Amino acid sequence: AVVKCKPTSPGRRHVVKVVNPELHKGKPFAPLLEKNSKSGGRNNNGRITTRHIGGGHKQAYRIVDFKRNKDGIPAVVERLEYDPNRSANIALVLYKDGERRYILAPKGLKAGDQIQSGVDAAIKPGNTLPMRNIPVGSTVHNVEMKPGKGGQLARSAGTYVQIVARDGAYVTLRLRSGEMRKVEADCRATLGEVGNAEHMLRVLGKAGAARWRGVRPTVRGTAMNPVDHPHGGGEGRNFGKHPVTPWGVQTKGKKTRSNKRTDKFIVRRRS
Amino acid sequence: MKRTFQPSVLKRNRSHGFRARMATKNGRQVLARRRAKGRARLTVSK
RNA sequence: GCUUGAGUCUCGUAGAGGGGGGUAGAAUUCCAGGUGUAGCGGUGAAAUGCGUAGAGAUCUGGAGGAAUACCGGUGGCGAAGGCGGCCCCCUGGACGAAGACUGACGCUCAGGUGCGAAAGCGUGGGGAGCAAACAGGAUUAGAUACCCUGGUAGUCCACGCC
RNA sequence: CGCGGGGUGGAGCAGCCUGGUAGCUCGUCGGGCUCAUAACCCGAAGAUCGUCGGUUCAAAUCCGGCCCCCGCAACCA
RNA sequence: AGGACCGAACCGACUAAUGUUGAAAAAUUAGCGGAUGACUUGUGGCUGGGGGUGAAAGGCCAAUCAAACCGGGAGAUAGCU
RNA sequence: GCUCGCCGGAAGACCAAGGGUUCCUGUCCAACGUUAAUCGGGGCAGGGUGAGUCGACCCCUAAGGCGAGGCCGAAAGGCGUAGUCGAUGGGAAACAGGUUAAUAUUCCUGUACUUGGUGUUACUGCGAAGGGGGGACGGAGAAGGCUAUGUUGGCCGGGCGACGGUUGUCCCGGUUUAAGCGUGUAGGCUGGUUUUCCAGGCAAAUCCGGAAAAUCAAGGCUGAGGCGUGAUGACGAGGCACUACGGUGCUGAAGCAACAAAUGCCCUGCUUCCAGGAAAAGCCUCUAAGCAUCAGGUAACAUCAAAUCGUACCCCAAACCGACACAGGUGGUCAGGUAGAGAAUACCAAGGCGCUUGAGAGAACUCGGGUGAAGGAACUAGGCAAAAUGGUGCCGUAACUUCGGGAGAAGGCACGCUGAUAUGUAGGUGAGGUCCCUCGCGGAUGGAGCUGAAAUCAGUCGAAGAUACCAGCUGGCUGCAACUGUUUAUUAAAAACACAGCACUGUGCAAACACGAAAGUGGACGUAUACGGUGUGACGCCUGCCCGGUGCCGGAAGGUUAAU
RNA sequence: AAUUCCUUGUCGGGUAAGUUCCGACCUGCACGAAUGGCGUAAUGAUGGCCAGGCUGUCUCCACCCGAGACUCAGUGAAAU
RNA sequence: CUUUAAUGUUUGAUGUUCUAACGUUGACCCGUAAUCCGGGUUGCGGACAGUGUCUGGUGGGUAGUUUGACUGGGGCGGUC
């Protein structure tokens, strides 16, 4: 769990590690492991399309299963791997037929537990079944926007979408952002909230901690000159320009949302 | 101190080398301008 | 050594005793919608406020949180703090009957340890209602208040302090 | 010094830029109220516009000068 | 265990002196800061001119940068020497 | 040639990069060389680079590039699929000795090894762009086992000595040997074997995964080094011999032991932590398409082949980059002795140097240093600069604190040499012998030899024992920024920037946002505990009032209102 | 006060003597709450001030050792 | 003509429904040893979305430019 570090050195004083002893400390299951090269936040043109990110410790992409296409095959869980690519820990499930796949781990999950996909399985946690079969009000995660798409809503650690009501092929959802949103009933959803809810409690501690997370320094506009940023300038920390992104779009209060075609699925907006 | 020229024959040919010039239309236009000027060393080469 | 103190055993009895996990109904507010039209809300009296951008009143549906009506009883349980819907799970103490058993094993207790309303604080949730702070309106000679219309922390949950 | 602003009953403010009857609140005095004072209620008096001149039929209102007050400026080597 | 301590290589450049037609178009000598990390370095890639990149100084982009260099408009224009 | 001095974790010795003949031999001195010059990295001739095993080429990919079609774009062209390139990584194989004026792991001598081809013989189901396995990977730390390497002893040869002693506890030198082949050790990993079944491995599979039993418990893999062989060979201090007297020919001693010991090797190990740690081929295996008398594979044996390019020389510099024979800059590898914690520092070995003007004199003045009476910041903008402190063990140690610090606080003491304790101890190492054995690179007991701290006591020398070089000045009050870091290359290193943390706000995924007139990429192979922007800047205590102005958000009744 | 003009504000402390320093007073020209306010251990080639030790920094220079300066021979510049 | 009464009819604006245009950075097949692209089947949307022309708004994101003269130096003030 959460474990505050001893202040033997500065930059250690404030560190708070999140130990998770119930977790496999050896190497991951190799067959499901493809490489992931750093972008450095730079696209095809080589320009730096997204600032900040770049650098940081190397990591390989585990192939996590989402479609959960296998139906009616019971699946014994094996061990909880660490997945550096994500926030949530990933279980190494073993289906009866011998094929193995990684999957995001729900809170109530333990090693050796039985879990099944498909329209039959059960309302036990970790089962992935279409939402039309799911009781109203129950907590689910890894919800799909469209059948077979894989999984979209609720993947981050500790997150969970809460089904609210059903109507026809549509079914309302209270997304974690508090936004009510309709979906197709046939989309799959896995039962239970995602595990590792303590992810947020980590406080990293020193500067360098973010560095190997892949993050680089965020320079304030006020520090930059008037040519580099819409803010900046002045002899001694003046300001007074209404706050804006480096590209002159208004920040802080400006609405940027406009897809038109997705508007029909939303009900309540976030607040 | 360290001077601005730190030669490397590989990097040199990859950059200003003949084939590099033959890639883009602009490169080929360079070679056109150099033959027109009657210059002996068209491009640096092995 | 003895059994009248103290204690254990057997069948029971009552109880908002405690912790955990569910669940219901009434109501308030909020949202969408229908009907419908000029006031509503409030007060000692008013005003601010809300309202022809269609309020309030009224009906249907929905979402949320909190507390749990009558039963309720100078009734009950708990060491005290305290504990009120229903239901399961885990559990403490008391009391009664008839005996049986052990044989003074008891009483109090500085220092010590633990538990300890409300408010408050720390991390992370949640947020209906109520409401310090704050704001406006009145009252007044003044009114940093009492009264009114709003309203944030907080109140609620988990875990730590105090 | 340069510019701008102001001086009005006992206090604070209007009215001046739109030269033709100087107001508002408080204070003061007077009578009521009350055992008495305060509050409250009813009344009344109170300036003749910093100041010396000009202008005009008429100047607190326009003009200039003088005496204070107030604000901005008083810079570049 | 540590963006821990002292301290060579290694990287950096704080103070002083010399040098300033130098030994050198920013160095030498003496001391100095970091030195298992947000470290340092080799090879090889990628980002380009109103663009790049920037732990931000308007710093760096081949000894040149409040807008590179090279050729072209071009014998720009100059009430000024 | 003799002596002197300097470097020696380099100012030595190999390489890459880069140069491109500077290497060597003869000859020449105009120019070049900061002088002269018989000399040269200069001129002029001639010579010189030998590979199946080193490197490249070659096979395989990384980042990344080019990209049939394709998608998109006034044209140019952009993106990118299949593909195809791209080492800085992965992929078969060799050492020792001798030799040239200049090359050598390339020549010669000796002894090896690999991958193919072809054939012969004996066997046998072989076969993918497909499947699976393997290759295949972080950091930090801890030792243990070894070796390089060194020291001492013994052995062997030589010496007995310019001025006292020195045939002995004396002095000087030498005491080296690989790869390969055999042995499988310390040590690491792992339960193995057989049978039976399958919702899996875009098809199948006798392999892989998985599930059942049965059965024995070891078996198997990896593995430094040692010990043998290689090697009755080479090498070898020196002698024997001439010699164009530069060198060649001839011969040849001993060639062991103990100890110390790595940063190298076992260790692509083990333990541990989190930041969670390339790909692909070669390799092994499984079948499909197929073909089965074939072909094809396996083993043995023989035999052929291993092409082509680099190879000289410099390579922390006089040959590269700095206009220079320029106090500069530049990656990897080796790394001996004494003292030392040490790759620091000092003095040395191997080895290479004395930096291309010197010779005098011994003014001022400047530079770089040494020393100083008495006073001790009075100097000065300012203790700038100098001076001083400085090690190892032990004692002792404040406010304050986020309870880790502060702290090496401050301030002290001891320190050499000799003897004894102990004719060198504790410790480490481990012989001989002996004991036992599933018998070898075994296990016990055993203590020889060697190595070897630290301490107490006594004595002794100097003015001074951390004697050299090396090697903190300390304390107090206070501003600012929490901290480590980063910053104006070439006058600013900071209070500036970043920072963990906090808050606001945006974004529901074909996300926001950015680059691109598009396609498309990034964001992210992420999903609101996420991601973007903005501001503040750890931690503690906190964050008050104003919605007039400006901006954003929300609402539409009414007024105004574009093309149409 | 990194903010304070008048200002060497006023008082205290420090020194024989202190326009700077430390502690307060508040008359804040013209502090002030995330363009953050107020404290803060530890950290600093950071700013200010005091003390001990130490010294040629200084009173006040003196001598010495090397490299140049000077003389000879050779070569042989520059800015203007 | 007041008022609009019902019907018919032309056009306009809403609301609900459908699918064939169109979208699909949904699944599955073939080209095809291929996460591109096209084709095909199907689900999902569905006349919106999105693109063109015209059009209003916003727009220092970016560009081109302007920003006087006299003056007892210029600026400020004043003046033309």
Q: Whose C1' is closest to the CA of B11: which nucleotide?
A: E44
CA distance A215 to A202: 16
| CA A52 to C1' E62, whole Å | 29
A95 and A71 Cβ atoms separated by less than 8 Å: no
User: Count of CB atoms within 10 A of residue A173's CB?
Assistant: 25
Residue A207 vs residues A39, A46, A87, A134, A216: alpha-carbon distances, Å: 22, 27, 20, 45, 10
How is residue A82 annotated by DSSP? -
How many CA atoms within 13 Å lie on the side-chain side of B22?
Answer: 6
Specify which residues A103 forms β-bridges with.
Answer: A91
For strand A170-174 and strand A180-184, is the pairing parallel, antiparallel, or unpaired? Answer: antiparallel
Show which positions of strand H are touched by protein (CB under 7 A): 26-28, 43-46, 48-50, 59-62
Q: Is A91 buried (19+), middle (13-18) or exposed (0-12) by CB count in 10 A?
A: buried
Q: Whose C1' is closest to the CA of A233: which nucleotide?
A: E58
B14 touches strand E (CB under 7 A): yes
**Number of residues that make up chain B:** 46
Elucidation technique: cryo-EM
Specify which residues A143 forms β-bridges with.
Answer: A153
Place of tokens 């500790």: A158
For strand A74-81 and strand A61-62, is the pairing parallel, antiparallel, or unpaired? Answer: unpaired
Resolution (A): 3.5
Of A177, A107, A103, the C-alpha closest to A142 is A103
Tokens of A226: 């008037």
Instruction: List the alpha helices (DSSP H) in chain B.
Output: 9-16, 18-23, 25-36
A143 and A153 Cβ atoms separated by less than 8 Å: yes
Is residue B15 helix, strand or coil? Answer: helix
| CA A73 to C1' C139, whole Å | 79
> Domain residues of chain B, as ranges?
1-46
Tokens of A144: 């799909």
CA distance A82 to A27: 10
CA distance A55 to A60: 15
In the chain, the amino acid numbered B28 is R
| CA A104 to C1' F98, whole Å | 72
DSSP A28-76: --TTSEE-----TTB-TT-SB-SSS--------EE-B--S----S-EEE
> Which CATH number is correct for B1-46, 2.40.50.140, 1.20.140.10, 3.50.50.60, 1.10.287.3980?
1.10.287.3980
DSSP A163-231: EEEEETTEEEEE-TTS-EEEEETTSEEEES-BS-GGGGG----SHHHHHTTT------GGGS-TTTSSS
CA distance A182 to A89: 28
Q: What are phi and psi of A244, to 5 degrees?
A: -150, 150
A105 and A142 Cβ atoms separated by less than 8 Å: no
Residue A236 vs residues A148, A219, A226: alpha-carbon distances, Å: 57, 17, 14
Residues packed against strand G, CB within 7 Å: A 10, 222, 237-240
Place of tokens 């000027």: B37
Show which positions of strand E are touched by protein (CB under 7 A): 1-4, 26-27, 37-39, 43-48, 52-58, 62-63, 67
* Domains in chain A: ranges and CATH: 1-113 (2.40.50.140), 117-194 (no CATH), 195-271 (4.10.950.10)
Q: Whose C1' is closest to the CA of A178: which nucleotide?
A: F528
Query: Which residues numbered 52-111 in chain A sit less than 7 A from strand E, measured from CB?
Result: 54
CA distance A55 to A57: 7
| CA A194 to C1' C105, whole Å | 58
